[PDB]
């Protein structure tokens, strides 16, 4: 195998798929959300303003 | 009259729409003519292959009038074609084995957008992200593949 | 890559990786237990040693069994490459972010003048004849003692004397107790003139020795015997400094009496003393009572109007104490009730003006954010040049600092002034403080008028000595402004500017942050080799709350140059216009189009010069955009007006359609394919990290399977022939 | 979402502010879990007497208070309002933060240890605290809080960090002491987990471990699993 004029050689075939086999389970870190969900409620307001500043 | 009595989802072959008794259970009591109905369906779908199963909706009304509407085929069936399997995983997330590459997703999304009335407002990232979550539920992944698949005709209940 | 070089085993000293920053708990403190502490080493698994030895043995075979075959078949450019600091990382008070550092100026000698027109607050030791022999003996002990204790009181906020100095010096402890035996039995009239001597001249705001507690009883027993203003003197005597030495009830009494008896305070100066003392009130309801009164009492002199601006300046009602829901811009309506009530007097007789009453107007207006009071300034332009030679060292800085930011940080003056004020600065150069010097060096770069003679003799050594250290954190910024306005590029000077910020124990304030982030992208464009990481920890807290879009609601009002061309962009012609778009939270572009990274910035009376050239701001900004590949149409508002009206709309179209295409090609030509390249290399750095190392090594040899992928190198070829060479 | 898609495409570039902001908070917290904020708190209160019985206070909605002292120190017991007590919880920092009590000119440091509530009636019975003095050992609870690291290779994929202990009991001998502990587990692995002595080696000079409370330094906190596929392939085969 060699980097030809029409090819992007890579490494470790198995682990491209493994990255692509990953699927983030909703439930493996539920505790850490409750630190985070109760903080992010305010960012939604921060995008009401920004995405609507143009309309002003 | 124009008021909507009911809505039904269906699945039909393009040019072989025919008064199957396995569709009169839904459209029978509403008094709709299966023959006069299927005529107007096959007329529109003459520019489509006959092997393919589509879906349709019907706003059945109070006077037993109707207004049929056509949608793209089932998004799952389209992927079983590319994937060359008929049946998918019991489980999901835990059992991930199937693989498509993006270069067909970009092509089957156009199917939905060219026809479906709901996505007329939508972009392609939007549509492509819709099926990936549908792929997470099925045992499917999106990985680069240079090769092409070979033809397969996965079943449909019709 | 990195992970293959990883140690098979880590010691106890190596589990916790190194850090850019120490914590505040690694400080050296009083009590300590490292001495008796013993060292713990994490054990190794008994079965792992049976794995460590074998791999050590199979590795040892292949060393000799291959060497046997040979006989058969044969950087940190800040602090240099070594040496660098480690910034202490701590949790922080709000105070550090809203504190004007008092170093770099003999403050109190300077600050007492500007109030000195208020006679009633002037402290007088000899007014208290019984204790004056005692109080003055104390102050000898203050200055004569080691260190600079009284001089550190207001200055070094990290230092206190109510606990370090007074509670330990046993001579003083006798002297304060001589007082307590007297305080109870004095007349009620001498108390407030004593309190001033405590709070300012001695810095005793606490109740350590229990002195104020006796003053309260001797005070509260005879509240009704006082006049009005002799209560106001207590307010300023106690509440003007950090501890409000008195109680609540003793102040609620003062606070409740006064706003009933406003009908009897005779003079307007008596309101001046009043408002300057009662400025820290949290209740809005009673500021209106004051200003509603001042709108009733007309002023018939000129010293009165000065005595209101200089007071109303510092004594505004902040917007954070106001409610969250309120009438629009109601803070402004509180102002112009005064300014409309003053505009006649200050305008009719501004020629009648003198050096002590001279300074306080420039300050009173700059602190008030207006652009109307030019007429007084013109009468002042004529004033200085006459008396240019007879001026003091003090009246020079405040002029140079005042005219620099006259009309809302747009200056006001002429080349006659500043060229004259060089000499006035060169006279008193040794007498200025470091704050005053920088503020001169701002005003010239603010107009591009620095003499090359003048930077060499005085500024150049001064900066060389004091830029690295011995310079307060607030004075770097007036330097940080100017140098980029001077367009300087000497790296050795920017080092000290950065080394200070990194070494400085104090974090960056939001009051002074806007240059520190400009100067970042200034140096980054020139020099990509630096690492500004330490220069971001010092900037960490300020950037959190930082937003540039806050300026929008003001510029939408006070810039007609912005809207009128804006009307043309939207109504008549057609593009994906946006409006004010914040450039990475540092600028807000006047007008932009996206995704094409297009800019339509504008010159104006704010941003032009008499020469017609852009202000040295408006060339600074248009560098940074170009540095980040962000197209530009520098518009000049005069030239657009000169265009005939029918040709004004297409003229923009002819430009914008072209500037788009230059970027539209550039996205195809460079960026769009080049993102795939970084993407596909980003994809490897993940797959590199997903490796089972023990499985991947599998001996000493590394045999990775390799995936072929279609990739269109037809566009870009420098990277093909750059990779194909190193890779083989 | 709140704006139509057709307008969002024009303003897709705007959302850098969204993501550039979340850099700032979550990094700030993640590094500020350890440090006590430098902000003085005060609690006006009153002494105890034999007159003020519980139920007398509890119609007045005051509360008793109790402090346990240390070597050579006497205990102190006080009276205070309920709403003071809950406000003292309502800080982040309640597990360790130093709270003062002003009776008169005097101030008494303390920490939170716990509170008892009458469970069937659900009103506040007492609020118990622990004295703190600078020059002498003082019990505190240092919670453990583990950061995420995408720099290790096993942690990223199919492995699970296991925090067996929430905190550590220690003795502090100085004014400012660390709120908590923060760990970067890159160098850890299945082969070695973290052990308490790896912490004992890295602390300030004013801190020591309370051996009376813990079992042994060889005890371990953070453990790391093996891979899941290497199980799963073996599970099926």
- C-chain CB neighbours of A54 within 8 Å are 578-579
Chains that touch C (3 or more CB pairs under 8 A): A, B, D
In the three-class reduction of DSSP (H, G, I as helix; E, B as strand; rest coil), residue C466 is classed as helix
Report CA C121 to chain centroid distance, whole Å. Answer: 31
What is the C-alpha to C-alpha distance for residues C574 and C591, in angstroms, rounded to an integer?
A: 14
Query: CB neighbours of B39 closer than 8 A, spacing ≥ 6?
Result: none
> CA A27, A33, A37 angle in degrees (round to 5)?
130
Report CA D2 to chain centroid distance, whole Å. Answer: 38
What is the C-alpha to C-alpha distance for residues C266 and C297, in angstroms, rounded to an integer?
A: 10
> CA A29, D21, C89 angle in degrees (round to 5)?
85
Å between D165 CA and nearest CA of chain C:
18
The dihedrals phi and psi of C534, each to the nearest 5 degrees, come to -65, -35
Instruction: Check CB contact of C708 with chain B, cutoff 8 Å.
Output: yes
Query: CB neighbours of C331 closer than 8 A, spacing ≥ 6?
Result: C316, C317, C319, C322
Å between B95 CA and nearest CA of chain D:
10
What is the C-alpha to C-alpha distance for residues C143 and D53, in angstroms, rounded to an integer?
A: 55
b/e code C167-187 from CB counts within 10 Å (16+ = b): eebeebeebbeebeeebeebe
What is the C-alpha to C-alpha distance for residues B92 and B75, in angstroms, rounded to an integer?
A: 17
Task: Identify the residue among A8, A10, A20 best suited for mutation to test binding to B, counting B beta carbons within 10 A and taking the highest.
Answer: A20
Instruction: Check CB contact of D120 with chain C, cutoff 8 Å.
Output: no
Å between A2 CA and nearest CA of chain D:
28
Query: Which position has the token pair 């799952």?
Result: B76
Instruction: Check CB contact of C585 with chain D, cutoff 8 Å.
Output: yes
Closest residue in B to C680 (Cα) is B144
Q: What is the torsion angle, in degrees rounded to the nearest 10, for the CA atoms of residue C458, residue C464, residue C469 and residue C472?
A: 30
**CB nearest to C687's CB, from A8, A12, A54:** A12
Å between D231 CA and nearest CA of chain C:
14
D129 in Cβ contact with D65 (< 8 Å): yes
Chains that touch B (3 or more CB pairs under 8 A): A, C, D
- A-chain CB neighbours of D154 within 8 Å are none
Angle between helix C303-314 and helix C330-348 axes, rounded to 10 deg: 160
Q: Kindly state the DSSP code that residue B142 receives in the 8-state scheme.
A: B
Residue D37 exposed, middle or buried by CB count within 10 Å (0-12, 13-18, 19+): middle
Chain-chain contact of A46 with D11 (C-beta, under 8 angstroms): no
* Tokens matching residue D222: 């953070």
Chains that touch A (3 or more CB pairs under 8 A): B, C, D
Residue C143 exposed, middle or buried by CB count within 10 Å (0-12, 13-18, 19+): exposed
Residue C47 exposed, middle or buried by CB count within 10 Å (0-12, 13-18, 19+): exposed
C600 in Cβ contact with C578 (< 8 Å): no
**Residues in A lying within 8 Å of B, measured between beta carbons:** 16-17, 20-21, 23, 25
C622 in Cβ contact with C601 (< 8 Å): yes
Q: What is the largest CA-CA distance in chain C?
A: 115
- A-chain CB neighbours of C722 within 8 Å are none
- Quickly list DSSP for C472-503: -TTHHHHHHHHHHHHT---HHHHHHHHHHHHH
* Tokens matching residue B2: 């124009």
Q: Mind spelling out the 3-state secondary structure of chain D?
A: CCCCHHHHCCCHHHHHHHHHHHHHHHHHHHHHCCCCCCCCCCCECEECCCCCCHHHHHHHCEEEEEECCCCCCCCEEEEEEHHHHHHHHCCCCCCCCCCCCECCCCECCCEEEEEEECCCCCCEEEEEEECCCCCCCCEEEEEEEECCCCCCCCCCCCCCEEECCCEEEEEECCCCCCCCEEECHHHCCCCCCCEHHHHHCCCCCCEEECCCCCCCCCCECEEECCCCHHHHHHHHC
What is the C-alpha to C-alpha distance for residues C543 and C545, in angstroms, rounded to an integer?
A: 6
Q: Left if phi > 0, otherwise alpha if psi is -120 to 50, otherwise beta: which for C430?
A: alpha
Closest residue in D to B122 (Cα) is D5
What is the C-alpha to C-alpha distance for residues C346 and C304, in angstroms, rounded to an integer?
A: 10
Query: CB neighbours of B79 closer than 8 A, spacing ≥ 6?
Result: B100, B108, B131, B135, B138, B140
Q: Kindly state the DSSP code that residue C238 receives in the 8-state scheme.
A: H
* Tokens matching residue C682: 């980003």
What is the C-alpha to C-alpha distance for residues C118 and C308, in angstroms, rounded to an integer?
A: 11
In the three-class reduction of DSSP (H, G, I as helix; E, B as strand; rest coil), residue B70 is classed as strand
Å between D178 CA and nearest CA of chain A:
21
- B-chain CB neighbours of C711 within 8 Å are none
In the three-class reduction of DSSP (H, G, I as helix; E, B as strand; rest coil), residue C411 is classed as coil
- D-chain CB neighbours of C540 within 8 Å are 24, 28
In the three-class reduction of DSSP (H, G, I as helix; E, B as strand; rest coil), residue B56 is classed as strand
Query: CB neighbours of C252 closer than 8 A, spacing ≥ 6?
Result: none
Partnered with residue D195 across adjacent β-strands are D220
The dihedrals phi and psi of C679, each to the nearest 5 degrees, come to -60, -50
- Quickly list DSSP for B78-95: HHHHHHT-S---SSSSS-
C-alpha separations of C162 from C203, C204, C212, D235 in Å: 8, 7, 14, 73
Å between C552 CA and nearest CA of chain A:
9
* Tokens matching residue C339: 């300014």
Å between B127 CA and nearest CA of chain A:
20
Instruction: Check CB contact of D4 with chain B, cutoff 8 Å.
Output: yes
D142 in Cβ contact with D96 (< 8 Å): yes
b/e code C573-595 from CB counts within 10 Å (16+ = b): eebebbbbbbbebebbbbbbbbe
Query: Which position has the token pair 């520019």?
Result: B47
Chain-chain contact of A11 with C687 (C-beta, under 8 angstroms): yes
Q: Kindly state the DSSP code that residue C611 receives in the 8-state scheme.
A: T
Instruction: Check CB contact of A43 with chain D, cutoff 8 Å.
Output: yes
What is the C-alpha to C-alpha distance for residues C634 and C34, in angstroms, rounded to an integer?
A: 64
* Tokens matching residue C256: 């409740």
Chain-chain contact of A21 with B136 (C-beta, under 8 angstroms): no
Residue B110, H or E segment: helix B102-115
C-alpha separations of D205 from C433, D111, D137, D179 in Å: 42, 21, 13, 16
**CB nearest to A25's CB, from B93, B142, B143:** B93
* Tokens matching residue C623: 């560098």
What is the C-alpha to C-alpha distance for residues D152 and C689, in angstroms, rounded to an integer?
A: 7
**Residues in B lying within 8 Å of A, measured between beta carbons:** 93, 96, 99, 136, 141-144
What is the C-alpha to C-alpha distance for residues B92 and B72, in angstroms, rounded to an integer?
A: 25
C396 in Cβ contact with C387 (< 8 Å): no
**CB nearest to D11's CB, from A28, A48, A54:** A54
Task: List C residues 511-540 in contact with D (Cβ-Cβ < 8 A).
Answer: 540
Query: CB neighbours of C483 closer than 8 A, spacing ≥ 6?
Result: C445, C493, C494, C497, C519
Chain-chain contact of A1 with C706 (C-beta, under 8 angstroms): yes
Task: List D residues 200-229 in contact with A (Cβ-Cβ < 8 A).
Answer: 229
Count A/B contacts: CB-CB distance under 8 Å: 15
What is the C-alpha to C-alpha distance for residues C218 and D23, in angstroms, rounded to an integer?
A: 58
In the three-class reduction of DSSP (H, G, I as helix; E, B as strand; rest coil), residue B133 is classed as helix
- Quickly list DSSP for C351-403: SS--HHHHHHHHHHHHTT--S---HHHHHHHHHHHHTSSS--SHHHHHHHHHG
Report CA C553 to chain centroid distance, whole Å. Answer: 22
Cis peptide preceding C595, ω within 30 of 0: yes
Chain-chain contact of D206 with C40 (C-beta, under 8 angstroms): no
Chains that touch D (3 or more CB pairs under 8 A): A, B, C
What is the C-alpha to C-alpha distance for residues D216 and D196, in angstroms, rounded to an integer?
A: 8
> CA C129, C131, C135 angle in degrees (round to 5)?
120
Chain-chain contact of B122 with D4 (C-beta, under 8 angstroms): no
Instruction: Check CB contact of C2 with chain D, cutoff 8 Å.
Output: no
**CB nearest to A10's CB, from C580, C709, C724:** C709
What is the C-alpha to C-alpha distance for residues C624 and C621, in angstroms, rounded to an integer?
A: 5
* Tokens matching residue D71: 């070597």
Q: Mind spelling out the 3-state secondary structure of C287-320?
A: HHHHHHHHCCCCCCCCHHHHHHHHHHHHCCCCCC
Partnered with residue D129 across adjacent β-strands are D67
Closest residue in A to D11 (Cα) is A51
What is the C-alpha to C-alpha distance for residues D146 and A32, in angstroms, rounded to an integer?
A: 11
What is the C-alpha to C-alpha distance for residues C570 and C671, in angstroms, rounded to an integer?
A: 29
> What is the radius of gyration, based on Cα positions, of chain C?
34
The dihedrals phi and psi of D81, each to the nearest 5 degrees, come to -85, 150
In the three-class reduction of DSSP (H, G, I as helix; E, B as strand; rest coil), residue C636 is classed as strand
* Tokens matching residue B114: 């060219």
Residue B133 exposed, middle or buried by CB count within 10 Å (0-12, 13-18, 19+): exposed
Breaks (C-N over 2.5 A) in chain C follow: 74
C195 in Cβ contact with C215 (< 8 Å): yes
Q: For C116-268, where are the alpha helices, taking DSSP H only?
A: 129-144, 170-183, 191-199, 211-220, 229-239, 249-258
- C-chain CB neighbours of B103 within 8 Å are none
**CB nearest to D191's CB, from C33, C48, C544:** C48
Q: Kindly state the DSSP code that residue C509 receives in the 8-state scheme.
A: P
In the three-class reduction of DSSP (H, G, I as helix; E, B as strand; rest coil), residue C707 is classed as coil
**CB nearest to B93's CB, from A16, A17, A23:** A23
Task: List D residues 137-166 in contact with A (Cβ-Cβ < 8 A).
Answer: 157, 160
Instruction: Check CB contact of D5 with chain B, cutoff 8 Å.
Output: yes
Q: C15-20: long-range contacts (C-beta < 8 A, 24 or more apart)?
A: C15/C42, C15/D187, C15/D188, C15/D194, C15/D198, C16/D183, C16/D184, C16/D187, C16/D198, C16/D202, C17/D184, C17/D186, C17/D187, C19/C86, C20/C86, C20/C87, C20/C533, C20/C534, C20/C537
Q: How many helices (H) and strands (E) does chain A have?
A: 3, 0
- Quickly list DSSP for C34-64: TTT-----PPPPHHHHHHHHHHHHHHHHHHH
In the three-class reduction of DSSP (H, G, I as helix; E, B as strand; rest coil), residue C577 is classed as strand
Q: Kindly state the DSSP code that residue B57 receives in the 8-state scheme.
A: E
How many beta carbons lie within 10 A of that of residue C544, not counting itself?
Answer: 15
C-alpha separations of C235 from C126, C197, C311 in Å: 21, 14, 16
Chain-chain contact of C579 with A54 (C-beta, under 8 angstroms): yes
Q: For C529-647, where are the alpha helices, taking DSSP H only?
A: 534-537, 540-545, 552-555, 560-567, 616-627, 637-642
* Tokens matching residue C698: 């599998």
D196 in Cβ contact with D164 (< 8 Å): no
- Quickly list DSSP for C68-119: HHHHH----TTT-SS----EEE----SGGGG----TTS-HHHHHHHHHTT-S
- B-chain CB neighbours of A21 within 8 Å are 96, 141
Start-to-end C-alpha separation, chain A: 58
In the three-class reduction of DSSP (H, G, I as helix; E, B as strand; rest coil), residue C592 is classed as strand
Report CA D204 to chain centroid distance, whole Å. Answer: 18
* Tokens matching residue A11: 């490494």
Resolution value, angstrom units: 3.7
Task: Identify the residue among B103, B123, B145, B146 best suited for mutation to test binding to C, counting C beta carbons within 10 A and taking the highest.
Answer: B146
* Tokens matching residue C181: 């035996």
Å between C393 CA and nearest CA of chain D:
41
What is the C-alpha to C-alpha distance for residues C654 and C649, in angstroms, rounded to an integer?
A: 9
The full length of chain A comes to 56
How many beta carbons lie within 10 A of that of residue C208, not counting itself?
Answer: 14
How many beta carbons lie within 10 A of that of residue B91, not counting itself?
Answer: 8
Nearest to C422 by CA among C611, C474, C399: C399
Beta strands (DSSP E) in chain B are 4-13, 53-61, 68-71
D110 in Cβ contact with D47 (< 8 Å): no
Closest residue in D to C577 (Cα) is D10
* Tokens matching residue D43: 């609690």
């Amino acid at each position: 195998x060699x980097x030809x004029x029409x090819x992007x050689x890579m490494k470790f075939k198995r682990e491209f798929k493994f990255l692509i086999k990953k699927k983030n389970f909703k439930f493996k870190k539920f505790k850490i959300l409750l630190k985070i969900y109760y903080s992010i409620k305010n960012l939604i307001n921060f995008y009401k303003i920004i995405k609507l500043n143009n309309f002003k | 009259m124009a008021e909507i009595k009911a809505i039904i989802n269906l699945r039909l072959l393009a040019g072989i729409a025919k008064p199957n008794p396995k569709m009169g259970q839904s459209l029978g009591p509403l008094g709709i003519n299966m023959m006069h109905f299927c005529k107007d369906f096959n007329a529109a779908t003459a520019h489509i292959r006959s092997d393919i199963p589509l879906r349709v909706q019907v706003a059945a009304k109070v006077d037993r009038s109707y207004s049929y509407i056509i949608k793209p085929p089932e998004t799952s069936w389209l992927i079983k074609k590319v994937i060359m399997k008929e049946k998918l995983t019991q489980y999901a997330g835990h059992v991930n084995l199937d693989y498509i590459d993006v270069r067909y997703v970009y092509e089957i999304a156009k199917i939905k957008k060219e026809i479906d009335i709901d996505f007329k407002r939508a972009t392609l990232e939007s549509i492509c992200n819709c099926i990936i979550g549908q792929c997470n539920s099925m045992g499917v992944n999106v990985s680069i593949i240079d090769e092409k698949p070979k033809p397969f005709n996965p079943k449909a209940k019709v | 890559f990195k992970g293959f070089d990883k140690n098979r085993w880590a010691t106890s000293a190596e589990v916790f990786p190194e850090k850019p920053f120490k914590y505040g708990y690694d400080k050296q403190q009083k009590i300590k237990t490292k001495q008796d502490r013993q060292w713990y080493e994490a054990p190794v698994g008994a079965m792992t040693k049976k794995r460590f030895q074998t791999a050590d043995f199979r590795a040892y075979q292949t060393e000799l069994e291959e060497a046997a075959q040979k006989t058969l078949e044969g950087k940190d450019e800040i602090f240099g490459e070594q040496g660098a600091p480690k910034r202490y990382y701590d949790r922080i008070l709000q105070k550090e972010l809203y504190f004007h550092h008092r170093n770099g100026k003999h403050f109190f000698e300077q600050a007492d003048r500007k109030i000195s027109f208020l006679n009633q607050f002037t402290p007088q030791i000899e007014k208290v004849p019984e204790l004056a022999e005692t109080l003055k003996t104390i102050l000898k002990i203050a200055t004569e003692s080691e260190g600079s204790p009284l001089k550190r009181a207001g200055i070094d906020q990290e230092f206190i004397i109510e606990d370090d100095f007074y509670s330990e010096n046993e001579e003083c402890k006798k002297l304060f107790e001589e007082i307590k035996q007297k305080v109870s039995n004095m007349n009620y009239r001498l108390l407030p003139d004593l309190c001033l001597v405590l709070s300012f001249k001695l810095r005793y705001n606490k109740d350590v020795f229990g002195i104020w507690e006796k003053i309260e009883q001797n005070f509260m027993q005879s509240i009704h015997h006082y006049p009005v203003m002799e209560l106001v003197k207590m307010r300023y005597a106690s509440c003007a400094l950090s501890p409000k030495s008195l109680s609540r009830d003793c102040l609620k009494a003062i606070h409740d009496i006064v706003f009933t008896e406003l009908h009897n305070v005779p003079s307007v100066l008596d309101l001046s003393h009043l408002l300057f003392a009662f400025r820290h009130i949290n209740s809005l309801k009673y500021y209106n009572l004051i200003l509603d009164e001042i709108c009733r009492r007309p002023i018939k002199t000129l010293q009165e109007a000065i005595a209101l601006l200089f007071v109303f300046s510092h004594s505004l009602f902040p917007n954070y104490k106001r409610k969250e829901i309120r009438e629009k811009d109601q803070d402004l309506k509180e102002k112009h009730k005064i300014v409309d009530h003053l505009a006649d007097a200050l305008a009719n007789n501004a020629k009648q003006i003198q050096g002590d009453d001279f300074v306080r107007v420039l300050i009173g207006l700059n602190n008030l954010q207006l652009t109307t009071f030019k007429d007084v300034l013109t009468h002042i332009e004529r004033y200085i040049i006459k008396n240019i030679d007879t001026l003091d060292a003090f009246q020079t800085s405040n002029a140079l600092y005042g005219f620099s930011k006259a009309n809302n940080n747009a200056g006001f003056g002429s080349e006659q002034l500043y060229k004259a004020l060089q000499k006035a600065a060169e006279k008193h150069w040794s007498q200025f403080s470091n704050a005053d010097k920088a503020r001169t060096f701002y005003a010239f770069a603010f107009q591009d008028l620095v003499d090359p003679v003048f930077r060499k003799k005085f500024i150049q050594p001064w900066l060389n000595e004091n830029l690295e250290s011995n310079l307060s954190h607030s004075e770097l910024h007036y330097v940080a402004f100017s140098l980029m306005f001077e367009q300087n590029k000497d790296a050795e000077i920017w080092k000290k500017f950065v080394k200070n910020i990194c070494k400085n124990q104090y974090v960056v304030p939001v009051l002074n942050y806007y240059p520190i982030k400009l100067a970042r992208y200034y140096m980054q464009s020139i020099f990509p080799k630096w690492n500004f990481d330490i220069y971001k920890l010092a900037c960490q807290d300020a950037e959190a709350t930082w937003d540039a879009s806050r300026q929008i609601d003001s510029i939408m009002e006070n810039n007609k140059e912005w809207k009128s061309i804006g009307v043309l962009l939207q109504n008549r012609l057609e593009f994906n216009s946006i409006g004010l778009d914040n450039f990475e939270n540092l600028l807000l572009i006047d007008w932009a189009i996206m995704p094409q990274r297009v800019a339509i910035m504008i010159q104006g009376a704010r941003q032009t010069l008499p020469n017609g050239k852009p202000t040295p701001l408006h060339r600074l900004k248009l560098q940074l955009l170009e540095n980040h590949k962000f197209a530009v149409f520098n518009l000049i508002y005069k030239d657009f007006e000169a265009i005939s009206p029918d040709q004004k709309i297409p003229y923009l179209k002819k430009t914008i359609e072209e500037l788009i295409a230059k970027q539209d090609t550039y996205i195809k030509d460079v960026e769009e394919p080049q993102q795939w390249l970084s993407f596909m290399d980003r994809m490897q750095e993940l797959t590199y990290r997903n490796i089972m190392i023990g499985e991947a090594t599998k001996g000493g040899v590394i045999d990775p399977e390799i995936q072929e992928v279609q990739f269109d190198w037809s566009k870009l070829q420098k990277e093909l022939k750059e990779r194909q060479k190193q890779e083989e | 979402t709140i704006v139509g898609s057709q307008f969002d495409a024009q303003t897709e570039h705007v959302n850098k502010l969204a993501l550039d902001l979340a850099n700032k908070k979550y990094r700030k917290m993640a590094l500020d879990q350890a440090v006590l904020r430098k902000e003085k708190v005060v609690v006006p209160a009153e002494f105890r007497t034999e007159k003020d019985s519980l139920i007398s206070l509890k119609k007045e909605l005051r509360s008793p208070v109790y402090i346990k002292g240390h070597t050579g120190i006497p205990d102190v017991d006080l009276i205070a309002d309920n709403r003071q007590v809950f406000s003292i919880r309502r800080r982040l920092q309640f597990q360790n933060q130093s709270f003062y009590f002003k009776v008169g000119n005097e101030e008494f440091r303390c920490t939170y240890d716990h509170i008892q509530i009458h469970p069937m009636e659900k009103w506040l019975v007492y609020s118990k605290y622990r004295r703190y003095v600078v020059g002498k050992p003082n019990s505190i609870f240092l919670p453990i809080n583990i950061l995420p690291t995408f720099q290790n290779n096993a942690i990223v994929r199919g492995s699970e960090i296991v925090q067996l202990l929430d905190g550590i009991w220690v003795n502090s001998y100085n004014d400012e002491y660390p709120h908590s502990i923060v760990i970067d587990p890159e160098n850890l692995s299945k082969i070695r987990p973290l052990r308490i002595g790896d912490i004992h080696n890295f602390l300030p000079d004013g801190v020591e471990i309370d051996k009376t409370k813990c079992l042994s330094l060889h005890q371990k906190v953070i453990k790391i699993t093996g891979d899941k596929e290497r199980k799963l392939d073996i599970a099926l085969q």
